[PDB]
Amino acid sequence: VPQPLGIIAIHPSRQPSSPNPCASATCSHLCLLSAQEPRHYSCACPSGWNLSDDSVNCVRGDQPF
Amino acid sequence: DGRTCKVTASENLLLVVASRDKIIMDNITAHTHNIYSLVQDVSFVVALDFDSVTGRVFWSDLLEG
Ligand SMILES: *[C@@H]1O[C@H](CO)[C@@H](O)[C@H](O)[C@H]1NC(C)=O
Ligand SMILES: *[C@@H]1O[C@H](CO)[C@@H](O)[C@H](O)[C@H]1NC(C)=O
Numbered sequence: 001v002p003q004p005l006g007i008i009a010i011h012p013s014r015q016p017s018s019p020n021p022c023a024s025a026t027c028s029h030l031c032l033l034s035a036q037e038p039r040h041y042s043c044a045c046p047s048g049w050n051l052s053d054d055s056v057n058c059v060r061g062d063q064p065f
Numbered sequence: 066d067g068r069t070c071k072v073t074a075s076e077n078l079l080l081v082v083a084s085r086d087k088i089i090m091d092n093i094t095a096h097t098h099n100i101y102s103l104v105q106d107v108s109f110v111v112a113l114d115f116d117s118v119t120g121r122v123f124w125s126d127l128l129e130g
Contacts, residue, residue, distance in 0.1 A: 003085040006113040006124075010079040013072050015117040 027056040081122060083110035088124060 022031035027043030034042040043059035045051055052059055078093040081103070088103040088110055108128035115122055 001082060001084045001087065003109075004082050005111050006083040006123075008081045008113040008115050009114045010081060010117075010122075012117060014115070034128065042090050 025056070027058075029058055081113055081115070083113045083124060085109055088113070088122070 014060070021033060021039065021041035025031045025041055025043065027062040029046060029049070032042055032044055034040055043051070043056060043058075046060075048061060048065070050059040051057075076095075080091040080093065082089040082091070086107060086109075088107060089092040090101055090103050092099040092101075103122065107124070108126050110124045111127050113122065114124075
């Protein structure tokens, strides 16, 4: 194999099933799994945005960069 | 032997490697290797990841960016 930079294995055993915390969420940009309890989920806005006290919504920019 | 573990889903395994122009794929049926190429139009594959929910393969290319 001349240039084997990456390798992956594809079986049903390598991606074990688990319940999804994010399915219950409704935040407007991203939902990410989180080790913190009890929600086990958190929401993330695009790079440069803020996150409102309303943890499911985001605000954008309004400051020089 | 009461110590070894095996997979319920068939033992058949799919192994994918990234080598420049080819996303080499190996299919281990029984212990016989079967080798074929997933895609013709790729330039320089670096990173390979597998998604079991859609049944898809993801790869990144150094030349195509
Ligand atoms: C979020 O808003 C505050 C003003 O309330 C601002 O100072 C801050 O820079 C914004 N986000 C970041 C971390 O840039
Ligand atoms: C691997 O090879 C077997 C036999 O050719 C085939 O039935 C199977 O679909 C191939 N792919 C996977 C993921 O098992």
